[PDB]
DNA sequence: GCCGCCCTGGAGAATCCCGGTGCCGAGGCCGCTCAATTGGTCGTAGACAGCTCTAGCAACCGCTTAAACGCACGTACGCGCTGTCCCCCGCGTTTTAACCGCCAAGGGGATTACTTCCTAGTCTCCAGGCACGTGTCAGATATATACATCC
């Protein structure tokens, strides 16, 4: 998911634009992947429960 | 008639038992004597109470995922048997030194008593080192943007 679908141009080395619009995740992968998700300029967060 | 040989009885000496007396191990008694006891005083160690903050605990949840478990196979190793040879054990003989009993004098060290003085405990006062918290600063890291180039 991270290398095939996050980036429109994952083959580049500079700034990578986002390809998706909404990302669904759970709490376990929020804590497991803090480093791979914190460096994303999010526009909106919706936390259920 | 005279001389030599076999059978049997009572008195002299050795041994067991008992009593009187002297010597070794241990306990009661006495004397010194120093350390435990008793009595009193006082300071403080610790018990108790109180408040605050953090860790643990019982019993439940949910998710992930790597470790545990079960099973099949295979093969390596534990184990048993046999041979062999060699080295340790048993014994007889000879040596030798440990052990015990001896000088010969001298120093080391354990006590007993005494003297002295240096150094460490104790007390008071003070200050700086250690513990904690924070502002700031230079090295490391990531990316923004401009230039040369291949297809």
Curated annotation (Swiss-Prot):
Consequences of knocking out this gene: Decreased sensitivity to the cytotoxic effects of 6-azauracil.
Subcellular location(s) per record: Nucleus
Domain of life: Eukaryota
UniProt family annotation: Belongs to the SNF2/RAD54 helicase family.
Other notes: Present with 1620 molecules/cell in log phase SD medium.
Domain notes: The 2 chromodomains are involved in the binding to the histone H3 methyllysine at position 4 (H3K4me3).
Record text on subunit structure and interactions: Component of the 1.8 MDa SAGA complex, which consists of at least of TRA1, CHD1, SPT7, TAF5, ADA3, SGF73, SPT20/ADA5, SPT8, TAF12, TAF6, HFI1/ADA1, UBP8, GCN5, ADA2, SPT3, SGF29, TAF10, TAF9, SGF11 and SUS1. TAF5, TAF6, TAF9, TAF19, TAF12 and ADA1 seem to be present in 2 copies. SAGA is built of 5 distinct domains with specialized functions. Domain I (containing TRA1) probably represents the activator interaction surface.
Function, as annotated: ATP-dependent chromatin-remodeling factor which functions as substrate recognition component of the transcription regulatory histone acetylation (HAT) complexes SAGA and SLIK. It recognizes H3K4me. SAGA is involved in RNA polymerase II-dependent transcriptional regulation of approximately 10% of yeast genes. At the promoters, SAGA is required for recruitment of the basal transcription machinery.
Protein name per Swiss-Prot or TrEMBL: Chromo domain-containing protein 1
Organism of derivation: Saccharomyces cerevisiae (strain ATCC 204508 / S288c)
């Amino acid at each position: 998911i991270r290398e095939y679908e996050f980036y429109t141009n994952p083959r580049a080395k500079g700034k990578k634009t986002m390809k998706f619009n909404v990302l669904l995740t759970t709490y376990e992968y929020i804590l497991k992947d803090r480093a791979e998700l914190g460096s994303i300029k999010w526009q909106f967060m919706a936390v259920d429960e």
